[PDB]
Amino acid sequence: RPSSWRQEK
Amino acid sequence: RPSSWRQEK
Amino acid sequence: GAMGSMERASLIQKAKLAEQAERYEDMAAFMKGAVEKGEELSCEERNLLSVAYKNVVGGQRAAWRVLSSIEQKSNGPEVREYREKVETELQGVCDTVLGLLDSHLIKEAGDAESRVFYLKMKGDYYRYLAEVATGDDKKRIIDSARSAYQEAMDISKKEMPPTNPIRLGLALNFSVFHYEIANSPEEAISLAKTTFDEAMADLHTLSEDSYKDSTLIMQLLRDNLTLWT
Amino acid sequence: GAMGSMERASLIQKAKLAEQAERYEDMAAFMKGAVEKGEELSCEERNLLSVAYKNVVGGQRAAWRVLSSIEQKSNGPEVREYREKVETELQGVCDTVLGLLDSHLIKEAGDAESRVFYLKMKGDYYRYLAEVATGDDKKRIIDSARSAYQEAMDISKKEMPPTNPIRLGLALNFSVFHYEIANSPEEAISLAKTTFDEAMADLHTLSEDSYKDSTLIMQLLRDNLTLWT
Numbered sequence: 399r400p401s402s403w404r405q406e407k
Numbered sequence: 408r409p410s411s412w413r414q415e416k
Numbered sequence: 417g418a419m420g421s422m423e424r425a426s427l428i429q430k431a432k433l434a435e436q437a438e439r440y441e442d443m444a445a446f447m448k449g450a451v452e453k454g455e456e457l458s459c460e461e462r463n464l465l466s467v468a469y470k471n472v473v474g475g476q477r478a479a480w481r482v483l484s485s486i487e488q489k490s491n492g493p494e495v496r497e498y499r500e501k502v503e504t505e506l507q508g509v510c511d512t513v514l515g516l517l518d519s520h521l522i523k524e525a526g527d528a529e530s531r532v533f534y535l536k537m538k539g540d541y542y543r544y545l546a547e548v549a550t551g552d553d554k555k556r557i558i559d560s561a562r563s564a565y566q567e568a569m570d571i572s573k574k575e576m577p578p579t580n581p582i583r584l585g586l587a588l589n590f591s592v593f594h595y596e597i598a599n600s601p602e603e604a605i606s607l608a609k610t611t612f613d614e615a616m617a618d619l620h621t622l623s624e625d626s627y628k629d630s631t632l633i634m635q636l637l638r639d640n641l642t643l644w645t
Numbered sequence: 646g647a648m649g650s651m652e653r654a655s656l657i658q659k660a661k662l663a664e665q666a667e668r669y670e671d672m673a674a675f676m677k678g679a680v681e682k683g684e685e686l687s688c689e690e691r692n693l694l695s696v697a698y699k700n701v702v703g704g705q706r707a708a709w710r711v712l713s714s715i716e717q718k719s720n721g722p723e724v725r726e727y728r729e730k731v732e733t734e735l736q737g738v739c740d741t742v743l744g745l746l747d748s749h750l751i752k753e754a755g756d757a758e759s760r761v762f763y764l765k766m767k768g769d770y771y772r773y774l775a776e777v778a779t780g781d782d783k784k785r786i787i788d789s790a791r792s793a794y795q796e797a798m799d800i801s802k803k804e805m806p807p808t809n810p811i812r813l814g815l816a817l818n819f820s821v822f823h824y825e826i827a828n829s830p831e832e833a834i835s836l837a838k839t840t841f842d843e844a845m846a847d848l849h850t851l852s853e854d855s856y857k858d859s860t861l862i863m864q865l866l867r868d869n870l871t872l873w874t
């Protein structure tokens with residue numbers, strides 16, 4: 399459910 | 408480029 | 417048979433689970449094991465076989481086109497080597513599908529719906545092989561796709577109504593073959609148009625659900641005609 | 646070493662090609678071979694290692710959650726067996742990444758940017774192991790993730806500005822660990838809020854490009870605080 403780090407879009 | 412058969416969405 | 421120890425019904429159940437998890441490599445391996453049980457496939461089971469390998473080869477084709485486009489702009493050996501690696505893996509999947517159809521799905525398919533489905537698959541995966549062919553076997557690969565499509569067309573026009581979704585999808589892909597592979601755009605346009613019109617004249621016979629099945633594929637024919645004309 | 650015969654520079658080049666083709670399994674295999682050359686990784690090379698294995702394990706985690714949700718609603722053995730198969734494959738990828746960090750990326754990383762990056766990775770992949778753990782090793786797996794995150798936090802607060810993207814991403818993931826794994830939502834909220842505020846007060850020192858790097862990750866912290874409060 400929560401956001402971990404992810405690459406930019 | 409053209410569309411072959413594909414499953415419904 | 418890596419799946420030789422699993423029950424046929426369990427392989428089908430796990431193929432449906434792999435589809436829900438979008439694990440199409442697993443799905444293809446399950447359906448390959450189900451086919452190798454030696455029994456004919458039901459309508460639903462044929463759909464699972466199509467879904468699994470179309471998604472697998474679909475990702476391979478998309479990756480191949482990305483790498484081939486990078487290779488064309490460049491012309492080290494790395495780009496060529498990696499495009500060759502993906503290309504070899506794509507050809508292995510196509511050879512696997514064609515092997516399943518030849519041993520022994522096609523020869524045991526007597527009904528029109530099953531036989532046309534398998535022959536359309538045979539044309540499709542020879543078409544995917546033709547997309548990457550460059551050597552001495554390209555013309556024979558192209559003719560192998562054309563021959564499989566043609567036999568499927570002959571049966572479908574004899575045994576199926578013009579609105580049958582398999583007949584429609586077959587004509588759609590054969591027209592794509594004509595345009596993209598055989599350098600016959602006028603044959604592609606003529607096939608797509610007559611397929612659309614003859615299905616349109618048969619829609620009045622269909623139920624609400626069959627109407628939706630047919631018009632969905634008719635829209636794909638319309639999209640190509642808009643792109644080609 | 647299946648990649649032992651390929652040049653290190655060729656492995657890096659093909660890893661970038663696999664990223665462009667969205668072939669993340671190939672990308673991880675290339676970067677694994679590059680790491681096993683025995684040399685430290687550059688900043689760009691560390692990014693390639695992260696991108697490859699995050700996408701691979703990301704698809705495995707998504708498939709595992711689909712299968713586990715089907716399994717919970719049901720409770721044949723097929724659903725459990727297939728969830729176990731995906732789970733075992735996910736654990737193998739996590740063990741592979743942790744093995745690369747332990748042999749010998751972490752012990753050779755002296756700079757703060759490299760050491761914090763690897764320790765954050767160690768916490769991340771122990772966190773992914775903890776998501777699926779149910780036996781006698783769950784608490785030790787959870788503490789292994791906590792210990793790796795904590796050492797990374799200690800170094801980052803000593804050697805990095807509050808706006809450093811690695812420090813921000815580390816705090817973001819440690820806060821997710823607190824909320825999702827450690828059953829400490831108040832620690833998760835407190836960490837996410839102090840990380841956001843202290844980065845906000847440091848934005849005035851940054852260039853336009855560094856400003857965009859930091860605010861991107863600050864938005865992820867804001868998204869979680871909105872979800873949690």
Ligand SMILES: *Cc1ccc(-n2ccnc2-c2ccccc2)c(OC)c1
Nearest residue numbers: 412459462463466533581582585586
């Ligand atoms: C190539 C093709 C055409 C049509 C279908 N299709 C649409 C709706 N149902 C089907 C179908 C399902 C199972 C077996 C045959 C046809 C299609 O689906 C695989 C493929």
Ligand SMILES: *Cc1ccc(-n2ccnc2-c2ccccc2)c(OC)c1
Nearest residue numbers: 403688691692695762810811814815
């Ligand atoms: C976990 C994490 C945080 C931040 C980044 N990142 C954002 C912009 N650049 C980076 C970066 C690139 C290479 C090495 C370290 C950080 C990130 O990217 C992998 C990961």
Ligand SMILES: [Ca+2]
Nearest residue numbers: 422423424425
């Ligand atoms: Ca049996």
Ligand SMILES: [Ca+2]
Nearest residue numbers: 651652653654
């Ligand atoms: Ca060398």
Ligand SMILES: [Cl-]
Nearest residue numbers: 497498501659
């Ligand atoms: Cl290669």
Ligand SMILES: [Cl-]
Nearest residue numbers: 430726727730
């Ligand atoms: Cl299984």
Ligand SMILES: [Mg+2]
Nearest residue numbers: 456524525526
């Ligand atoms: Mg028969």
Ligand SMILES: [Mg+2]
Nearest residue numbers: 685753754755
């Ligand atoms: Mg060093």
